[PDB]
TrEMBL record, chains A, M:
<protein>
    <recommendedName>
        <fullName>DUF3168 domain-containing protein</fullName>
    </recommendedName>
</protein>
TrEMBL record, chain C:
<protein>
    <submittedName>
        <fullName>Tape measure protein</fullName>
    </submittedName>
</protein>
Length: 127, 109, 38, 96, 100, 96, 96, 96, 96, 96, 100, 100, 127, 100, 37, 100, 100
């Protein structure tokens, strides 16, 4: 596997454990209760790093949707994810070390309802 | 680092991108109206001279005007003192509005 | 008879976007000129 | 008629328009009483419903009394030629 | 108009955010059902940032008018936000869109 | 007729329009009993269905009692010129 | 007729509308029995099909009883003036 | 007629509409046998094709039995005023 | 006629529709033989072309038997009222 | 006529439509020979041009033999009500 | 309407992604064929990022309505996704687009 | 329809690129001419990156249908790519655009 | 809680004290007199800073809407917000220190009325 | 035209900004009510930067014309800005938009 | 002559982008000072 | 056409920029008034970079034609720039827009 | 059609650029005048990078067709570039735009 798929799977193994639905993209016949997690496949740069290994930058985005009725709970999900996926993730072939996390929240009215949309981006150095 | 080229191209070309989408939706408006006319004007006197006379023109820059040139066509769109209305351009307004807006969005999304 | 024609019109405005783009362009040219001394 | 029965038919439960409906009903009664034979001093109870029916017609026609059609921005009405036309025949046939 | 269908009006009353508890719990007022007339149900594909949903854009009609404030309707088991309301002399016409 | 028999045909299953339907039915009965010869005291049961059918026609027409056409936000109706027109040919043919 | 034969023709395999169809059929039977000569206490079996045919017409017309035309946002009907018009001639020709 | 001979003309090759076509054909036979003189007990084979032709007309009209026009999402139909109209000139001319 | 001559005129070189055309031709032959004088057991060869002409008309009308018009996205047709109208006059004039 | 004389007028210069034009011409000859009095065995050469003209009219109409009008992707045609109409006034006036 | 053509409805039932095997294998439920009416086949050029494809945007009509959930149709040997379903009193009308 | 004009159909059959010779030479299958009906010739200005060209966007109509695969047409001495084909019961209608 | 929500709550607990209405977004049935505050959820970058702690950049935006009839009062609200939220904000888990504040104003005619729209951005380094 | 409704015209007179007190307090001139004719009230969703508002875009009609300058109207208890005024021979027609 | 209209007006919120690029400029200038002074 | 209104034509004759005095003072030629026919006055909101102005976009019609060059018209006390002039056999039609 | 006006066709024949002299002097072939029918003259404002010009977009019609290549027309003393030519059976129709 690429590091992309290794990390993406490790992220599902985490988030899918919370008991909220986790999806890559909602299909039309599929009913999703709020709150729910979107997760998007990592980008990955690679370059030579030592005479014996590559290293690179892998960027993971998970994306949390909830109704705005209770913000403390939504922020509880955001904190619970960041606490589960940092500072480092180990998998079979790759080690991931957090370099940055960026949290951005929007209030979204696209759907005739006031939803909270939090994007969590995490930049991992990888080796 | 060369980003100025991208902004320059946007400044230079998007005029024609908007003009093209307007022209395409104007043509589609006429085509759909020509169909919709026979779709509802079927009380049985049809020569189709109305449908021979739905046209459009580029009446201004980034402005296209569709026009039903047949003289009685208002009486058909709105009805009369003796006739029920059989509206034919209004149902196309409801279509081409959506296509135009979503295609202009897709030019910038 | 009377010429009871019907019109429908589709039209667009770009001139505001045009000026917003000019504003962004000259801001990036500001960056260009300070990067040249750096 | 009462007002309350026209009111019930048109489903109008408030009182905001009783001033208009009382004039409409007074008008319909006067017209029907004009259509009877000259001797007849009272509207036969057989016809008492016509007052109500035409009153509802007139209630709907408020703002379009002189007009065969009314339109604005996709609200449009077209009105029949004569409120009592259906009943001119019945009144005739009853007295002849 | 045939006024066959029954609509339940609602007002979702917006609460003030409480920073001590991180909540802004709204409350729903909900009214007795009214006879109305409504367009046939659509279930269009609407394409949100997270994916597809079955949207419904529609118009609903009632005779005369209602005394009270409203914001949403529930009809045919679908809940809609009112996005326009158009007030004729003897009739009221509401443009409504499904939420979600 | 009963109200329930009209109620069944138009598919209603609640009470929220009874006060209108009652007055509509009462009006249809009065009208039909106006069309019969003067000596007739009651609508004969042979014709009872007419009271139902017109009661449905009027139920649809509600809010349009005088109007030949009605457009409201893309919903368009056009109405038959006379509710009892079909039945005049039966009533007259029956008594004469 | 049975209900089941109208049901079969219109291809309606569930039971969600039997309450309406039974009223429609009861209405069509009553009307046809009104069009016969005054002496005739029973609908001739030669005509038993008309009840079914008109019932299907009326089933289609549900929600448009009094309306000559009906349209909304891509769906339009226009209706013929009289359900029994084709059969008035046949009933006449059979009794004359 | 057989069902199969109608089935062949409309190009059907499966069983999924037999219960409708059966009732359509049975209705056409009843109607045509209503149009012949009273002494006629059976449609003469000379006319058997009429039952087929009208059975096809009605198959197209299915879901529009009362309607002069039918528009559904950019499909639209307009219907002939009377299914047997052409054949009245043959039937009458044959018996008289 | 043969099938092959209708086939040749309409330019239809495959065999995908012979099941329909054979029924159409059988129908046109039966109708023409119905329009002749009652005594006449055989279609005169002078008229043998009518079967072919009407069969082509009907070939075109496949899917519009009862419809005076059909419209669909990009395509629409309008049909003449009676396939044999041109020939009713010739058949008459020949026998009278 | 010859085929070549029709072929020349419609501007054709190849063989790819001969089997249609042959049947069209053969039908036109049969029809015109149906319109003449019973004693006439052949179309007199005085009328031979009619067979050509109608053969061209029908060539245009090919694929629309029953249709008042035909619209196909912005191309719209409407057809004369009767191909021989002009010539009836000549044929009848000549024999009578 | 002439309801000549036969349509097969389908529901493609979306499975939960399995991170132990990197699979999210859906499953198709498929129904008995129904008589329908459908527009003439188009085969338009559609111009995707990877190139041209023969698309078909169409409408399909059925008498009354179906009890069961659906998502795709197969008809004329083409498979379509349902993108709108419009529900009239006695008739159901599906807007459908070919997949691929 | 008057089917006066004669069209030659073609299929340009796409070859698989050969990296040993840097060629992907297609091959043209070309068919016998068919009677068709076609709109009057246009010669519009079309404005490509390298400059103006005389384009022609048109529609062509044939009775019934053809058994065989096609991709281009040659008619009036102009070669067109087919960009839509629309399959009615007794008639086929092709939207075509000139190449170049 | 994240620093985002901790800051956002402290922002409400300040601005909501002036008695003018404060909102994250206006809903259609909700009547808001002028002047009023819109307040928008902070962005946060987080990264390693010492062997013992993260640190990061938390970006607050508050958004003051007034009719243009009296500019001195509108500016008084601007200055009151700045003076309350700077130089430092302390809360339960986090400290915030003003890195910069950027004030930008527009004359807004979108609503058929001449409004003043002031945007206040404050970039807090956070520890 | 039925001129049933009563409109109050207004002129909002723009004052010069006073830099010593930071005020530009306008003043309203307001006129006697005039008989007018007006479209049915709409209450559309309008979607501003700060959120949703109930807007109303409308047309108002008066017989002949008014001698005096105007800028806003108040009618039905809603205040509108005039955004076009059209001056026919015997009639004046004002396009108006609600403020807020 | 009744006229139906569709208008499209095109926007870009460049006031954020300007502030970003200006912040970058002002940040770079600190380096130039640290180098020369 | 009723040619009631009187229009004054003008030509604003463009001078060449004088760099020694930084002036390019144009000069106006102005003609005798002509009988014309003109649309009813509009006063639309036009939304320039500095703000709102009362614009007027209009059409003016004159019998036969004028011998002489023109560029602006003054009518109803408003000055317009001619932006199109259309030349029929017996009639001339000018599209005009107010300046400012 | 009344074919009253007289049109002069032209072909501007494009020369190959000469790098020794930095010239690519084209040459005009010009033909005998033909009877034609033409729309009334427009003089629209067209708004180029350097400023306003009096543009004229128009249509010109001639009976049957011309044997010879063309590119521009001169008529009414205005020179146009042909931008479309539409070839009916008995008639040719040219869409033309003024140069400058």
């Amino acid at each position: 596997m690429t590091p992309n798929l290794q990390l993406y799977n490790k992220a599902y193994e985490t988030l899918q454990g919370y008991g909220f639905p986790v999806i890559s993209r909602k299909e039309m016949q599929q009913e999703i209760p709020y709150p729910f997690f979107v997760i998007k496949m990592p980008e990955s740069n690679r370059s030579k790093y030592t005479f014996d290994s590559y290293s690179g930058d892998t960027n993971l985005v998970i994306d949390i949707w909830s109704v705005s009725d209770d913000l403390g709970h939504h922020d509880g999900l955001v904190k619970r994810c960041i606490d589960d996926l940092t500072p480092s993730v180990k998998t079979n072939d790759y080690d991931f070390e957090e370099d940055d996390t960026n949290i951005t929240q929007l209030v979204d009215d696209t759907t005739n309802q006031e939803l909270l949309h939090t994007s969590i981006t995490i930049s991992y150095k990888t080796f | 680092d060369a980003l100025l080229n991208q902004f320059h191209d946007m400044k230079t070309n998007i005029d024609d991108d908007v003009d093209d989408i307007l022209q395409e939706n104007a043509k589609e408006y006429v085509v759909r109206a020509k169909l919709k006319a026979r779709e509802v004007m079927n009380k049985g006197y049809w020569t189709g001279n109305l449908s021979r006379n739905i046209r459009y023109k580029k009446t201004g820059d980034l402005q296209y005007t569709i026009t039903s040139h047949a003289a009685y066509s208002g009486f058909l769109e709105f009805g009369t003192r003796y006739m029920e209305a059989e509206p034919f351009m209004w149902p196309v307004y409801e279509v081409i509005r959506k296509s135009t807006v979503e295609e202009l969005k897709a030019l910038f999304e | 008879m009377t010429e009871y024609k019907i019109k429908a019109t589709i039209e667009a405005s770009v001139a505001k976007f045009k000026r917003q783009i000019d504003s962004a362009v000259k801001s990036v040219q500001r960056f260009k000129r300070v990067a040249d001394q750096t | 008629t009462t007002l309350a029965d026209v009111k019930k038919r048109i489903g109008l439960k408030d009182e905001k328009q009783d001033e208009q409906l009382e004039e409409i009903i007074k008008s319909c009664e006067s017209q029907l009483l004009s259509m009877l034979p000259i001797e007849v001093e009272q509207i036969p109870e057989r016809f008492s419903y016509m007052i109500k029916e035409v009153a509802v017609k007139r209630y709907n026609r408020i703002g379009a009394e002189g007009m065969t059609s009314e339109a604005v921005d996709g609200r449009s009405n077209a009105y029949e030629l004569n409120d009592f036309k259906e009943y001119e025949a019945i009144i005739d046939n009853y007295f002849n | 108009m045939r006024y066959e269908d029954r609509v339940i009006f609602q007002l979702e009353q917006v609460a003030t955010y409480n920073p001590k508890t991180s909540k802004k719990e709204n409350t729903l007022i909900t009214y007795d059902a009214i006879p109305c007339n409504i367009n046939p149900i659509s279930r269009a594909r609407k394409q949100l940032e997270f994916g597809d949903v079955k949207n419904d854009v529609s118009v609903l009609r009632i005779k005369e008018s209602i005394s009270y404030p409203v914001s949403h309707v529930l009809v045919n088991g679908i809940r809609y936000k009112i996005v326009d309301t158009r007030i004729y002399r003897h009739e009221t016409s509401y443009y409504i869109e499904e939420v979600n």
